[PDB]
Symmetry: D2
Subunit: 254 residues, 4 copies
């Protein structure tokens, strides 16, 4: 398997549509041993993770909770056994209050709302790296999820700003991670039908055409595969960077 | 008179080294009628602005103060006369706490500090646009100051993240401003000796900050095909004035680099 | 009082009064510049066109594929602007790609001889012109070329996109050379404008063409809108770069496209 | 151990055992790929070099400026892999620029005939090879070319930088064509590697300003790379190419993957 013998933490499962769920499934199919983290509704999340190919410890992690972050490494070590470390970490976490999204006027989002979104969607990438690098092996890999924010667009509004911040954060996390022999990268995914897409983006409210190899919004697997590629030993010279799993859409104007 | 008859708001003057001070000076040399905004040290800033070529009204603006923002357009209108609107707005404002800068570990900056910096340095570009677009004329121009954050680097740390956010904010402000026939752009400047350079950046570099800033300039000037002088804000001020003028009428949501060309060269 | 008062500027690329170069020339003269013009092939026609400008400027022949023309260029310019005078600006507004390299013609079917001709005229010649003219430019001077953002592929532009990608790279190296003379080098990436090249080269290779959709999409993306029939905003931007008001910008690209490239949709 | 198990892959660009293409071929074979190799001009030497690979692989002649070679390529490949079989992968690891276009030679003094030859071999031929080989590629297939980030100018690289800028653009159009076949096209932008191609850049540069500039660029690369950069180690670049050849980056095309230690993401 691509990830045989690798110990990987995966955050961000909320439903079986979650990009993180597919990342977890594919990683398990590829031999990885997982530690999962979930936010808020852990009982409900556990029922979802029970549907994964293999058993995995589920740990609670609210990235705005300083104690959760402080205790994370210790709780992970308890789950994987003393003397063992992680080889991979997946940040698949985002949030933005409704005022910062959709048809709500860009100028009307209060800073308190924007700040919450940036905390959860961007700063927390640094928080998780801070918490977990001390228990990561050399050759390890941290991967976060991105949506190309290089151009403005309808609806994505302040989440675009949060992703621009996340890209910059990733470049600095790479400088820290390199001290541990660890890579840090983002995967910029095209649109996928997830809860966030439905409840956050859709609640607040061309890709296949542009993508030379097409794009299926109902299929998170190609994105999951791309994350697994970064978690593997097969992109060993790439860090601080962004890999686009978007069908090539961002490389085409029409 | 590049800006003859234009009414332009300029924020960000704190000393006569401020990039905003030179923007104001050059704009007045080019015929602009200014309204200035200052933060915190209003008595001192008034003395500074007395050193500008022409008299200009000074208004208080703390961009974290909701009341200041809510009253801003009315206060500007009082300053320029009823029925008159602005043709230009200059955002030349930033802040980051020391924990977010320099040799202080990147991971050790608390979010409260990072958030304050992002509020002042990035969100406030949207706040200022929100406040002032209702009193801007078609053909108008909003300009903010940037430092190219497309790559990470020593010391700039969380301010790099704030500038990355600011660039994104600018692209959305352009969408809103277009409804008013107004452009929104950033000028990404090379390093200039200002109070922020000395007190924020320099303060966080530890001992021999002076030598490190000298080395930064040396590298920048080497990389820049036309060279770079960190003691001279005039080239940056002229660039901002170009964007405030009628001579870049088809540019919006964009970034103009006033950096000697350094960002175009690897070595 | 003009933006370009007292400046001596060479402008290449006029073929009709719709040429981007024609509008650049017009605005530059309105702003006090003294021009020397260069033209390719149809010189008598070009002379008739330039009789429509505010002031009649000398026209020099320049086929950028002709080594003899390039070798004699600086001397001919100096005679036209008067010995003792140097240039303050140079405008490269030149491009070409054979039909095989454009439109609905298959990308893979363009022979290298055709692609190479297009790259010679559209990209290499920016270096050729800088080589010829830098020795007669004043410090503070400005070389400007015309670009069309090639960072993403698109229908129809095909191999011209490749030539523009090459041109952007050439510009960054010309900036290194030009800096030795205190001269800036930059490109203006313009949105779509109804010119002879748009009609004859682009439109011609589109076959059964009538571009309307291109205009509508561009104007929709551009937060301040975009008018394909109006070259003036592009001409103004070029004049900004020729002026003293962007003195710290070189090796760069300024986008005069209504902001379209900053918006996804 | 089997990243490319069962995949048939063409690898161009081996001239020495220091060639990036040699290491690509080596790593691909380690991962189960069945290769066909192509070489230019010195075919006897290249055959002896390719005998040093972990497994045997047929060698074909290909001068990318030779229209006849390109026209016969698909048929010669099919002869090598057997009728009814197709390629799953293609590696373009080919570059050339005449001496006038590189190094201490002034940028303005390179004649267009020289620049054009370099662009022909280094950029246009990516399209040439895709045109020839797409009709014999399977869906899910992958074409990969080698890039050196040309987004900023730099000392010595001169007209090759222009050729790479052209190659990046070509790749985006090749992706449009390749997509019709269900095939991806991407470039790997590698950091500097001490292949025997280095003399093309540093040749004659000692004592000249360019000499120190080239070394400064190389040392700066390792400095900027958050995980460091070893110019003597082609393996990480080879692995990256293999990742693109694999089934594990199925949604990436018209794109550039940077195998450079992360250096391009850091200003200092
Ligand atoms: N769905 C898409 O189209 C798409 C495209 C590109 C990038 N992304 C990114 O992928 C990642 C996952 O999003 P998704 O589309 O799978 O939607 P999702 O709703 O399935 O996952 C989002 C996750 O964020 C978690 N989260 C929110 N606040 C948290 C907190 N305070 N602490 C810890 N976790 C918290 C949620 O609990 C949830 O599991 C995000 O970074 C998102 O921006 C999604
Ligand atoms: N100095 C450089 O090298 C350089 C380079 C590129 C970009 N910039 C940018 O230029 C701009 C001006 O910086 P400067 O270098 O002229 O330094 P400066 O210290 O002269 O100006 C910074 C300004 O921010 C103002 N400010 C801070 N908090 C504020 C608040 N809550 N409300 C309103 N104003 C507030 C300060 O009072 C001051 O006037 C900033 O955006 C900075 O990041 C500076
Ligand atoms: N029209 C647009 O939409 C548009 C948009 C962006 C950039 N551009 C660029 O603007 C510039 C001018 O193009 P235009 O649109 O005004 O079309 P145009 O047809 O009016 O001008 C093109 C010019 O190229 C000149 N030229 C061709 N071969 C030459 C040679 N061998 N030597 C010297 N000159 C030669 C022609 O004579 C002509 O004057 C080009 O670089 C073009 O790619 C055009
Ligand atoms: N070595 C580096 O640091 C580096 C870094 C990034 C990218 N690259 C790229 O990697 C690729 C291989 O470079 P390398 O360093 O392994 O050098 P190399 O000399 O080992 O390989 C270059 C290959 O091009 C082949 N070639 C030249 N003309 C040809 C023609 N007419 N037809 C077919 N093949 C031809 C040569 O025979 C040779 O095998 C090139 O595209 C190069 O630009 C090299
Ligand atoms: C122009 C249309 C924009 C749709 C983009 C697709 C998309 C959907 C959900 C995302 O996940 C989130 C989006 C917003 C807040 C939180 C999360 Br998780 C995300 O990052 C990106
Ligand atoms: C050695 C690190 C590189 C920085 C050099 C240039 C510079 C200096 C001051 C700035 O102004 C600020 C910098 C940080 C916070 C607030 C302000 Br205003 C700024 O944006 C950029
Ligand atoms: C749907 C197709 C896209 C058209 C874009 C607009 C445009 C038109 C003409 C141009 O000028 C030329 C275009 C090609 C060859 C020569 C010249 Br000059 C140019 O650069 C760009
Ligand atoms: C100042 C820059 C120093 C580092 C450059 C690394 C490098 C070396 C050889 C290359 O391959 C070639 C470069 C030129 C001609 C032929 C070939 Br193969 C190439 O693309 C890139």
């Amino acid at each position: 398997g691509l990830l045989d013998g690798k110990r990987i933490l995966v955050s961000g499962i909320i439903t079986d549509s979650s990009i993180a769920f597919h990342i977890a499934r594919v990683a398990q199919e590829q031999g990885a041993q997982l530690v999962l983290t979930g936010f808020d509704r852990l009982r409900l999340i556990q029922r979802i993770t029970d549907r994964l190919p293999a058993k995995a410890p589920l740990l609670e992690l609210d990235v705005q909770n300083e104690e959760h972050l402080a205790s994370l490494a210790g709780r992970v070590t308890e789950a994987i056994g003393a003397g063992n470390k992680l080889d991979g970490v997946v940040h698949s976490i985002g949030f933005m209050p409704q005022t910062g999204m959709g048809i709500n006027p860009f100028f009307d989002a209060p800073y308190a709302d924007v700040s919450k979104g940036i905390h959860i969607s961007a700063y927390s990438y640094a928080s998780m790296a801070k918490a977990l690098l001390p228990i990561m092996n050399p050759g390890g890999s941290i991967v976060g999820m991105d949506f190309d924010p290089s151009r403005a667009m309808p609806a994505y509004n302040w989440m675009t700003v949060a992703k621009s911040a996340l890209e910059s954060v990733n470049r600095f996390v790479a400088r820290e991670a390199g001290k541990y022999g660890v890579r840090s990268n983002l995967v910029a995914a095209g649109p996928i039908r997830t809860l966030a897409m439905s409840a956050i983006v859709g609640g607040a409210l061309g890709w296949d055409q542009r993508a030379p190899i097409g794009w299926n919004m109902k299929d998170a697997t190609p994105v999951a595969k791309t994350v697994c590629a970064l978690l593997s030993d097969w992109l060993p010279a790439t860090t601080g960077d962004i890999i686009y799993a978007d069908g090539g859409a961002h490389t085409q104007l029409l």
